[PDB]
Amino acid sequence: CDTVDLGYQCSPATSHLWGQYSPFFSLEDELSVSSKLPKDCRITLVQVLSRHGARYPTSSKSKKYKKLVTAIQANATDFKGKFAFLKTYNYTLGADDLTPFGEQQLVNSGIKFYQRYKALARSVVPFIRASGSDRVIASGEKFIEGFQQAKLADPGATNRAAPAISVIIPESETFNNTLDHGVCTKFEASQLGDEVAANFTALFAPDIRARAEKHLPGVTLTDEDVVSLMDMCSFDTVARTSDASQLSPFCQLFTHNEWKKYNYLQSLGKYYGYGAGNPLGPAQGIGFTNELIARLTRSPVQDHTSTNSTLVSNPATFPLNATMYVDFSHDNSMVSIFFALGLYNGTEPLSRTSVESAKELDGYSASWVVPFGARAYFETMQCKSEKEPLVRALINDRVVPLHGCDVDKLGRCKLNDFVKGLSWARSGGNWGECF
Ligand SMILES: *[C@@H]1O[C@H](CO)[C@@H](O)[C@H](O)[C@H]1NC(C)=O
Numbered sequence: 001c002d003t004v005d006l007g008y009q010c011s012p013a014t015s016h017l018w019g020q021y022s023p024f025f026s027l028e029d030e031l032s033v034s035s036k037l038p039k040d041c042r043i044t045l046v047q048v049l050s051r052h053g054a055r056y057p058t059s060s061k062s063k064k065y066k067k068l069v070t071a072i073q074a075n076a077t078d079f080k081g082k083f084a085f086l087k088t089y090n091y092t093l094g095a096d097d098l099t100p101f102g103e104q105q106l107v108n109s110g111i112k113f114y115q116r117y118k119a120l121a122r123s124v125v126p127f128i129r130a131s132g133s134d135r136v137i138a139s140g141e142k143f144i145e146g147f148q149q150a151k152l153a154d155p156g157a158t159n160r161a162a163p164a165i166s167v168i169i170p171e172s173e174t175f176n177n178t179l180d181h182g183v184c185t186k187f188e189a190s191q192l193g194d195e196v197a198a199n200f201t202a203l204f205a206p207d208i209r210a211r212a213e214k215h216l217p218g219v220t221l222t223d224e225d226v227v228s229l230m231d232m233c234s235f236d237t238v239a240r241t242s243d244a245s246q247l248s249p250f251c252q253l254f255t256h257n258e259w260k261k262y263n264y265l266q267s268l269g270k271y272y273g274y275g276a277g278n279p280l281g282p283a284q285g286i287g288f289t290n291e292l293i294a295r296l297t298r299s300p301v302q303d304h305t306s307t308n309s310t311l312v313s314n315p316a317t318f319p320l321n322a323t324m325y326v327d328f329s330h331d332n333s334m335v336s337i338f339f340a341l342g343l344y345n346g347t348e349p350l351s352r353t354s355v356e357s358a359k360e361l362d363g364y365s366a367s368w369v370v371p372f373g374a375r376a377y378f379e380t381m382q383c384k385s386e387k388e389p390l391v392r393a394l395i396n397d398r399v400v401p402l403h404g405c406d407v408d409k410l411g412r413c414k415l416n417d418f419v420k421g422l423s424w425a426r427s428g429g430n431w432g433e434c435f
């Protein structure tokens with residue numbers, strides 16, 4: 001179901017509609033030109049930003065789901081139709097960790113990164129950082145395994161030293177971490193994303209709850225419970241087999257139309273939680289943006305947001321000339337980063353009542369942007385067509401044309417023009433409002 005090149009392609013009418021719980025699926029050529037290296041161009045630098053792989057529910061969500069399944073099984077006097085499996089379903093999911101499928105996603109992502117950037121990778125040991133979350137670190141280790149596997153299979157490789165994760169950035173409300181938000185006090189107290197999600201759920205869940213209650217006589221569901229049951233489709237799928245080759249029985253409880261609503265609910269939560277819908281959302285991505293500018297320009301970091309001055313000032317933890325960089329992070333931080341970079345500046349504020357597709361939102365959705373095992377590639381290339389280095393952004397294989405600069409038909413801008421266009425991030429944006 002899941003391949004190195006294309007990601008997850010089984011049951012696409014369901015599995016691509018789980019938002020941030022969708023396994024990565026390649027968006028090569030989707031509302032986009034090809035992501036292929038253009039003729040007479042050579043990559044000179046690549047930065048990868050990768051999410052962790054598919055996982056179990058967090059400890060708190062796992063507790064909630066188990067509580068619900070138990071209550072259903074205790075209250076239902078019958079389990080009718082498609083809900084029949086809940087009579088004997090046994091809740092066995094863990095908490096927080098990668099599933100085997102999620103580990104393999106990341107091995108696959110490392111293989112794909114080697115293959116895509118083979119010309120550089122043959123001689124380069126990438127510089128790698130990970131946010132201080134066990135599933136993120138584990139994802140980094142699996143990416144490295146895949147990278148090394150592909151490199152060993154390539155007779156043309158000259159430097160096969162394994163890259164280490166050189167920096168693990170602590171996750172703490174008082175540690176400045178560009179790969180995991182937490183220090184912007186006002187933002188961390190924001191309820192907007194949760195309120196938008198709740199309001200939208202109140203629109204679509206009632207009909208679903210009625211149908212489920214009809215097929216589970218004795219059971220009373222809330223809106224929240226409907227969403228929990230829908231969440232279980234993805235979580236159970238990515239857990240129950242090592243290759244996620246069997247759709248969970250939870251999945252067929254809901255229609256394709258309902259999956260499109262669920263997918264949009266997830267898009268709303270990320271947009272209004274972490275993206276441009278949140279007044280301090282894109283500010284959470286400024287620190288990484290300034291780190292990326294430092295790498296692109298081989299220059300010291302200039303930032304006063306979520307960088308740590310000790311970490312960025314030491315070559316051992318922030319080398320300025322490493323040619324390949326790979327950073328491991330989380331959905332929410334990656335959404336903020338993509339918005340801070342201006343990559344979704346063609347997306348209008350999402351309707352809170354009407355479902356708009358990624359097609360109609362200029363390529364923005366949770367499933368297109370931060371699926372499980374999400375990856376972004378930020379390239380510099382030197383092309384014979386242009387004296388100046390050109391930058392290109394690929395998000396889950398889709399070329400995401402740059403904003404703020406004079407963008408060409410291939411989605412690229414000249415390096416200095418791109419950096420100039422990131423004036424908001426370079427100034428620190430509205431970070432002062434944090435406090
Ligand atoms: C910056 O990193 C240093 C070295 O790890 C650490 O001692 C310090 O507390 C960090 N400060 C912040 C605010 O992240």
Ligand SMILES: *[C@@H]1O[C@H](CO)[C@@H](O)[C@H](O)[C@H]1NC(C)=O
Nearest residue numbers: 191192193195196198199352
């Ligand atoms: C939720 O809906 C209520 C009633 O329609 C509305 O007043 C409120 O603004 C909504 N919340 C958000 C953040 O959209």
Ligand SMILES: *[C@@H]1O[C@H](CO)[C@@H](O)[C@H](O)[C@H]1NC(C)=O
Nearest residue numbers: 068071072075218219220221
């Ligand atoms: C199960 O029944 C109990 C006791 O009436 C009730 O409080 C609870 O909400 C019910 N839960 C479900 C999921 O039906």
Ligand SMILES: *[C@@H]1O[C@H](CO)[C@@H](O)[C@H](O)[C@H]1NC(C)=O
Nearest residue numbers: 176304305306307308309310
């Ligand atoms: C951490 O970030 C805050 C601004 O958010 C800044 O005041 C402080 O200097 C930073 N500390 C370090 C060590 O970078």
Ligand SMILES: *[C@@H]1O[C@H](CO)[C@@H](O)[C@H](O)[C@H]1NC(C)=O
Nearest residue numbers: 341342345403404421422424
């Ligand atoms: C993206 O749009 C926002 C809001 O208009 C603006 O502040 C920011 O500078 C834009 N980014 C780029 C890179 O053009």
Ligand SMILES: *[C@H]1O[C@H](CO)[C@@H](O)[C@H](O)[C@H]1NC(C)=O
Nearest residue numbers: 127315316318319320321322
């Ligand atoms: C590049 O130079 C940096 C100093 O900015 C140094 O720490 C490191 O040896 C180099 N980067 C690599 C090869 O990881």
